[model samples]
Target: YDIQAWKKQCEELLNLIFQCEDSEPFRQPVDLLEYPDYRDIIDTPMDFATVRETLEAGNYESPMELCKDVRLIFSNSKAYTPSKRSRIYSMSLRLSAFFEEHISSVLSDYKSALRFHKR
Candidate 1:
């Protein structure tokens, strides 16, 4: 596949993520004052807004890179939420599942296209 098509797919996934109710917490950077140790815990803090900006700036070379950052948002939440019972932690799981379900088809097709072109 085409790089432009990959970028468009990334954008479409992001839009779906942004529309999710559980995505509210992942939409923006964690508040430093509220979560003072966030930076210390998360070596690379990723958020939906940051991903959107990075994608718009053409900073991501591939859809896989973009997906990595998107996954980071949920993983960071799960790591910092202290307990699986926490609302944020559960939201992270739900959102992560939703994202994975949607992206799997896109990824599979992209990989197939790559192999087809290489042949």
Candidate 2:
């Protein structure tokens, strides 16, 4: 099954579910329910833009250094576990969207969120 496709569908479902439905109190979970198999999202992608955003994260040397370390790990290691790879990818996604001033400590939002998903 195409996991990336499924994830995109689920994202659309989530968008509808958490919408600003001031006119309606109910949220729409029906669309996803009707096609439950298709709702099993499994994959996410990484690319060049994500790399720049993660590496160029400003006013946040801890995360930036961590990002460099992760890249070095990726480069030096011949193999990677799925969990390690996914956390790396997710961190890049988040760091790209973080507030520069808020990432001063080593406990960056990306690290926290990655830890949350680790188990």
Per-residue C-alpha lDDT of model 2 across residues 1-119, encoded as one tens digit per residue: 22123223323322442342320211221133543542244122222233334444532244444344334423322122245555443443333333222323333444555556674
Cα deviation of 51, candidate 2, in Å: 11
Q: Which lDDT values do the candidates have, in the order given?
A: 0.85, 0.34
Segments of candidate 1 deviating more than 4 angstroms = 1-3
Off by over 4 Å in 2: 1-101, 105-107
Residues 33-61, candidate 1: write the lDDT tens digits.
99899988888898899999999999987
Per-model TM-score on C-alpha atoms: 0.90, 0.18
Clashing pairs in 1: none
- CA lDDT, candidate 2, residue 3: 17
Candidate 1, lDDT over the whole model = 0.85
